[PDB]
Amino acid sequence: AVSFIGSTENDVGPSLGSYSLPFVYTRNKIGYQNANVWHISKGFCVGLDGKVDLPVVGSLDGQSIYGLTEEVGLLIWMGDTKYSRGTAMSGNSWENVFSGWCVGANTASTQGLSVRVTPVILKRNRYSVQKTSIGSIRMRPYNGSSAGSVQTTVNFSLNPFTLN
Numbered sequence: 326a327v328s329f330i331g332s333t334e335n336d337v338g339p340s341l342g343s344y345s346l347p348f349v350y351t352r353n354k355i356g357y358q359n360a361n362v363w364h365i366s367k368g369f370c371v372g373l374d375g376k377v378d379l380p381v382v383g384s385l386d387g388q389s390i391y392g393l394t395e396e397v398g399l400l401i402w403m404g405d406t407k408y409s410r411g412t413a414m415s416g417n418s419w420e421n422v423f424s425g426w427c428v429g430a431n432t433a434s435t436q437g438l439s440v441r442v443t444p445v446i447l448k449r450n451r452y453s454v455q456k457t458s459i460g461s462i463r464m465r466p467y468n469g470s471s472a473g474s475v476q477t478t479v480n481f482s483l484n485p486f487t488l489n
């Protein structure tokens with residue numbers, strides 16, 4: 326079985342956090358993590374797809390730099406719960422960010438996710454960014470499992486932050 330147990334709207338990073346061309350700035354500080362977004366059981370197989378809606382203004386080592394303002398951009402990761410499992414995002418299409426797993430035929434667990442970003446200074450003049458929509462992540466059932474009657478997609482918004 327599968328049930329949606331998380332939240333539809335999720336904030337990335339602590340609200341109004343401060344961090345000290347182009348040049349990259351934050352580890353896992355600017356992120357959102359939730360190990361329990363869906364409850365799964367009895368053989369349910371699930372992975373995750375991710376999509377970034379921000380405009381791509383460039384790229385660094387194979388991944389897109391998404392634009393926020395003239396001065397600030399972002400490198401973005403989406404994936405399974407643990408931050409080190411994040412998949413570098415490029416473009417604006419749905420991408421496989423977690424290959425997936427199957428819970429035991431006679432057991433239950435949960436499926437989580439994480440979104441992480443790192444600031445990128447595009448233009449220099451402190452830099453402040455306001456709450457901005459980043460994109461979404463949708464569960465990807467496989468092996469015959471069904472999204473059935475469950476919310477498959479959740480959204481992410483970047484909390485306001487300041488770069489010194």
Ligand SMILES: CC(=O)N[C@@H]1[C@@H](O)[C@H](O)[C@@H](CO)O[C@H]1O
Binds near residue numbers: 359361406426435
């Ligand atoms: C409570 C918990 O930690 N649940 C995790 C879940 O967040 C994760 O998405 C999944 C696949 O790695 O493995 C579960 O054990």
